[PDB]
């Protein structure tokens, strides 16, 4: 039942500036700035797509190994994940680079100044999935989450070499890759995850028809925001599941990651496609209603009640029975 | 022999941008920016004036208590200091704020974009030195390092209330305080530390003559950069000690902090004024030759050799004998 999650591991360091960046920028010597912002607030969120997905799977009680690259400063993040049941044995720790970091300061008019530090992320290309297979045996599924582009290809190729079922998450990189590069991420996939816009892009760029893709993959999962999700089998059967109604639209960061994690946890727990997408939808709404990506809580009774409200008591009982 | 160090506790998070900020700034919508810098490097240095001074005293084998405000994220920094002999029992840990942070990105033309997050620093005004006195007895000296302005005043007043000898470090705040406010930081001091420019400023702003100050304090210590240091007693005796010659001018950050720490360690170890300033000068040059402020090493044999080279074998033997 073990899901190996590959992809980025990062933290986000977010600061609030009470004033207006413009008031410092407008008079500036733009050819050699010396800007100093006195900030009000500092919030740190654990993130990266692989971290977010591993977190959610762990919290739901699934079997999960996080497989990605970080720095020695990953230690607290490791502790946080291990407490939620996440196997971190196969996180590569860089000798030289820190864990990837996104730092952003936002002003009162929502202007933003950000830095992205990739750090240890490009070292994911040095991970061997054969090492995971030696230690814990063949994972039930390997998620190919957004990552260092080369690492995404190497992990996908290795899944083929080792006979591991993999999930193609081509999203973030579709706009940046050639059609031929995209094809190589998709061929032989157990699952393909994209949103609706990305799905149309994937087809256009690859020169593939839908029929072409469905002969390459076992299930297309296409998310539709508030319109729910489509699950399409190679036989032409389609299942559409609507969302769990939100009470807050607070923070849409990490909502796609959480859907995937909940859906795949469902699958590993033996749930069918519809029940799995219903669970995915619940995890997604809980992330939507939380600031950050791993700041949400799992309340068994509340989950049961919310699933019942969205999908009926029968669906809810069947879903909760697998935790 | 216990020195209680009050003042700021912080970390510095420094990033390098390979390109030019101008190339992103010049075309920008300055009224609502959305800047994203892909950075090359991330270096974190432990800092704050109290942290730097406590570190140096600890490393030299002196008895030291760090007395300042930080956040729960101070834990690793605490571990780092405790390993160097620093008592951290009386660091106030905020319930709500993180440890103060300076974050700075520098481009290829040395343009800079920085944020300062004060965080837990204003909570230093809630520290009671009477709590230190209960736990470890009366410190031999309390350093009033640059801090939250109100905390500097409250700590100085409490030193008077409790009968504790204190060191006035009025530097960073001289330009910002009234003459009357400056007087209140100076009255009754065991030591006054400033540089030469700051000394002239202090006099002008307070309306005090030198004679006026020397009737308030037990020793004026005035640092002169590469020209060394003056030590002036209330009797009119002056001792000038020249610097230990540098082999690198790498990073002048923290050099004033290190001089103070080395000098005061000397004093607590029973060394006279000249020998103490000779030790201070060595610690200062070691910081000058290191990037950051607590990244330097203490090598007993190397110290002895360098002190001998600057000040003679007799001076060196007397200095090293107290570690
Ligand atoms: N307003 C809303 N209320 C409840 N659930 C929602 C929602 N919007 C999205 N979701 C859930 O999250 C899933 C994925 O969201 P979406 O289709 O926006 O993917 P995405 O990849 O565009 C998000 P990201 O910006 O994180 O990449 C949806 O299928 C749905 O289950
Ligand atoms: N070029 C140099 N070589 C060796 N030692 C030096 C030096 N410059 C300064 N020092 C040492 O450090 C001491 C304090 O330096 P300085 O007089 O620059 O204080 P300051 O308060 O201006 C530094 P800061 O910018 O950290 O506040 C000097 O008295 C000297 O012992």
From Swiss-Prot, chains A, B:
<feature type="binding site" description="in other chain">
    <location>
        <position position="52"/>
    </location>
    <ligand>
        <name>substrate</name>
    </ligand>
</feature>
<feature type="binding site" description="in other chain">
    <location>
        <position position="12"/>
    </location>
    <ligand>
        <name>substrate</name>
    </ligand>
</feature>
<feature type="binding site">
    <location>
        <begin position="223"/>
        <end position="228"/>
    </location>
    <ligand>
        <name>ATP</name>
    </ligand>
</feature>
<dbReference type="InterPro" id="IPR002173">
    <property type="entry name" value="Carboh/pur_kinase_PfkB_CS"/>
</dbReference>
<keyword id="KW-0067">ATP-binding</keyword>
<keyword id="KW-0808">Transferase</keyword>
<feature type="binding site">
    <location>
        <position position="195"/>
    </location>
    <ligand>
        <name>ATP</name>
    </ligand>
</feature>
<feature type="binding site">
    <location>
        <position position="256"/>
    </location>
    <ligand>
        <name>ATP</name>
    </ligand>
</feature>
<dbReference type="InterPro" id="IPR011611">
    <property type="entry name" value="PfkB_dom"/>
</dbReference>
<dbReference type="GO" id="GO:0004001">
    <property type="term" value="F:adenosine kinase activity"/>
</dbReference>
<dbReference type="Pfam" id="PF00294">
    <property type="entry name" value="PfkB"/>
</dbReference>
<dbReference type="GO" id="GO:0044209">
    <property type="term" value="P:AMP salvage"/>
</dbReference>
<feature type="active site" description="Proton acceptor">
    <location>
        <position position="257"/>
    </location>
</feature>
<feature type="binding site" description="in other chain">
    <location>
        <position position="257"/>
    </location>
    <ligand>
        <name>substrate</name>
    </ligand>
</feature>
<dbReference type="InterPro" id="IPR029056">
    <property type="entry name" value="Ribokinase-like"/>
</dbReference>
<feature type="binding site" description="in other chain">
    <location>
        <position position="8"/>
    </location>
    <ligand>
        <name>substrate</name>
    </ligand>
</feature>
<dbReference type="GO" id="GO:0006166">
    <property type="term" value="P:purine ribonucleoside salvage"/>
</dbReference>
<feature type="binding site" description="in other chain">
    <location>
        <begin position="172"/>
        <end position="173"/>
    </location>
    <ligand>
        <name>substrate</name>
    </ligand>
</feature>
<comment type="similarity">
    <text>Belongs to the carbohydrate kinase PfkB family.</text>
</comment>
<feature type="binding site" description="in other chain">
    <location>
        <position position="102"/>
    </location>
    <ligand>
        <name>substrate</name>
    </ligand>
</feature>
<feature type="binding site">
    <location>
        <position position="36"/>
    </location>
    <ligand>
        <name>substrate</name>
    </ligand>
</feature>
<feature type="binding site" description="in other chain">
    <location>
        <position position="48"/>
    </location>
    <ligand>
        <name>substrate</name>
    </ligand>
</feature>
<keyword id="KW-0547">Nucleotide-binding</keyword>
<comment type="subunit">
    <text>Homodimer.</text>
</comment>
<protein>
    <recommendedName>
        <fullName>Adenosine kinase</fullName>
        <ecNumber>2.7.1.20</ecNumber>
    </recommendedName>
</protein>
<comment type="function">
    <text>Catalyzes the phosphorylation of adenosine to adenosine monophosphate (AMP). Can also catalyze the phosphorylation of the adenosine analog 2-methyladenosine (methyl-Ado) to methyl-AMP, the first step in the metabolism of this compound to an active form that displays antitubercular activity. Is not active on guanosine, inosine, deoxyadenosine, cytidine, uridine, or thymidine. Prefers dGTP and GTP to ATP as phosphate donors in vitro.</text>
</comment>
<keyword id="KW-0418">Kinase</keyword>
<dbReference type="InterPro" id="IPR050306">
    <property type="entry name" value="PfkB_Carbo_kinase"/>
</dbReference>
<comment type="pathway">
    <text>Purine metabolism; AMP biosynthesis via salvage pathway; AMP from adenosine: step 1/1.</text>
</comment>
<dbReference type="GO" id="GO:0005524">
    <property type="term" value="F:ATP binding"/>
</dbReference>
<feature type="binding site" description="in other chain">
    <location>
        <position position="116"/>
    </location>
    <ligand>
        <name>substrate</name>
    </ligand>
</feature>
<keyword id="KW-0460">Magnesium</keyword>
<keyword id="KW-0660">Purine salvage</keyword>
């Amino acid at each position: 039942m073990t899901i190996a999650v590959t992809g980025s591991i990062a933290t986000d360091h977010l600061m609030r500036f009470p004033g207006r960046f413009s008031e410092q920028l407008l008079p500036e010597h733009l050819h050699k700035v010396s800007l100093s912002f006195l900030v009000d607030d500092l919030v740190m969120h654990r993130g990266g797509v692989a971290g977010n997905m591993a977190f959610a799977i762990g919290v739901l009680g699934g079997e999960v190994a996080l497989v990605g690259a970080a720095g020695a400063d990953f230690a607290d993040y490791r502790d946080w994940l291990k407490a939620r049941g996440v196997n971190c044995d196969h996180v590569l720790i860089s000798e030289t680079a820190h864990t990837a970091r996104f730092t952003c300061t936002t002003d009162v008019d929502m202007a933003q100044i950000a830095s992205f530090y990739p750090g240890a992320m490009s070292e994911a290309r040095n991970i061997k999935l054969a090492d995971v297979v030696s230690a814990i045996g063949k994972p039930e599924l390997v998620i190919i989450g957004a990552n260092d582009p080369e690492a995404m290809f190497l992990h996908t190729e290795e899944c083929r070499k080792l006979g591991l079922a993999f999930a193609a998450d081509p999203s973030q990189q579709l706009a940046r890759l050639s059609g031929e590069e995209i094809r190589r991420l998709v061929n032989g996939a157990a699952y393909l995850f994209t949103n609706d816009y990305e799905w149309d892009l994937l087809l256009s760029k690859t020169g593939w028809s839908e029929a072409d893709v469905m002969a390459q993959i076992d299930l297309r999962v296409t998310t539709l925001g508030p319109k729910g999700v489509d699950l399409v089998e190679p036989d032409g059967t389609t299942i559409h599941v609507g969302v769990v109604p939100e009470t807050s639209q607070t923070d849409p960061t990490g909502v796609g990651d959480a859907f995937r994690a909940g859906f795949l946890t469902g699958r590993s727990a033996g749930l069918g496609l519809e029940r799995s997408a219903q669970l995915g939808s619940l995890v997604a709404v809980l992330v939507l209603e939380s600031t950050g990506t791993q700041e949400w809580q799992w309340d068994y009774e509340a989950a049961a009640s919310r699933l019942a409200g969205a999908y009926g008591e029968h669906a809810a009982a069947e879903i909760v029975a697998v935790l």
